[PDB]
Design a protein around this ligand. Structure first.
Ligand SMILES: C[C@]12CCC(=O)C[C@@H]1CC[C@@H]1[C@@H]2CC[C@]2(C)[C@@H](O)CC[C@@H]12
Ligand SMILES: O=C(O)Cc1cc(I)c(Oc2ccc(O)c(I)c2)c(I)c1
Length: 250
């Protein structure tokens, strides 16, 4: 147990990132979403640094590195948020950032109440399944390799191999506490189901942010440079079916 791999994941895990939201001003759709967008931009910088530090990531073609990050950031961020919410507030609220916590009122004011419900549900799963910090860490890494173009990447072979190895690492983590061969199988099943559950949530958020970007000027919501570029160039590839999540289960 505690292989080199685990040492690495625990070492590169991003720290706390604030949204920069003004909690003194009364909530408003525009302010809440603009802050969420700014948070996304800030978190993206951390996700990029984190990914480049992942074992074997830099071996992928440079265009594939940027591509997987551009396609998987939503799922990665939502999954990490679900974890923060569970550990910080026991899933009572969505802990996007220390300065941007959503209670039911904000979930409503944000105009994405249903999406927040699914996200809070995901947060609860971390408790219902008793997910460990190590399991969380390995699952999150695997999420970076869980969405690619239907026609493949520049060098699919390398990606396929890397993804396989990350799956193997999850196996090791699972086997490192399951004496009985029955609980080990069940666990992998459970975690892959949890991992898959992230995709539909990310898709709904992709749909929502895309629409928001389109009418951003009319509702006065600001989108930082990178966010606007990725949501108008990469996200549509996902929504149009050119890029799809890799599901474990059908
Ligand atoms: C990824 C972020 C920001 C980082 C995080 O903690 C999860 C959260 C999930 C909702 C996203 C938000 C970024 C900005 C988005 C994409 C808004 O435009 C609509 C949905 C928001
Ligand atoms: O032994 C461990 O746990 C550490 C470990 C983790 C991983 I992910 C891994 O997979 C690859 C695959 C291709 C490649 O170029 C690189 I760099 C790493 C290997 I090999 C070893």
């Amino acid at each position: 147990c505690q292989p080199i791999f685990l040492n690495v994941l625990e070492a590169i895990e991003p720290g706390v990132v604030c949204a920069g939201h003004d909690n003194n001003q009364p909530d408003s759709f525009a302010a809440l979403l603009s802050s969420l967008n700014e948070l996304g931009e800030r978190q993206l910088v951390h996700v990029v640094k984190w990914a480049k530090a992942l074992p074997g990531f830099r071996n992928l073609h440079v265009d594939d590195q940027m591509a997987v990050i551009q396609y998987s950031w939503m799922g990665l961020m939502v999954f990490a948020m679900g974890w923060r919410s569970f550990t910080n507030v026991n899933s009572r609220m969505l802990y996007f950032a220390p300065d941007l916590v959503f209670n039911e009122y904000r979930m409503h004011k944000s105009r994405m109440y249903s999406q927040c419900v699914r996200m809070r549900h995901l947060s609860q799963e971390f408790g219902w399944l008793q997910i460990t910090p190590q399991e969380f860490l390995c699952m999150k890494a695997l999420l970076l390799f869980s969405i690619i173009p239907v026609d493949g990447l520049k060098n699919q072979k390398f990606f396929d191999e890397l993804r396989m190895n990350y799956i193997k690492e999850l196996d090791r983590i699972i086997a490192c506490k399951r004496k009985n061969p029955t609980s080990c199988s069940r666990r992998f099943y459970q975690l892959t189901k949890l991992l898959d559950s992230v995709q539909p949530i990310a898709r709904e958020l992709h749909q929502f942010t895309f629409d928001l970007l389109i009418k951003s000027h009319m509702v006065s919501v600001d989108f930082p440079e990178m966010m606007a570029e990725i949501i108008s160039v990469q996200v549509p590839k996902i929504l149009s079916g050119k890029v799809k999540p890799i599901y474990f289960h059908t």
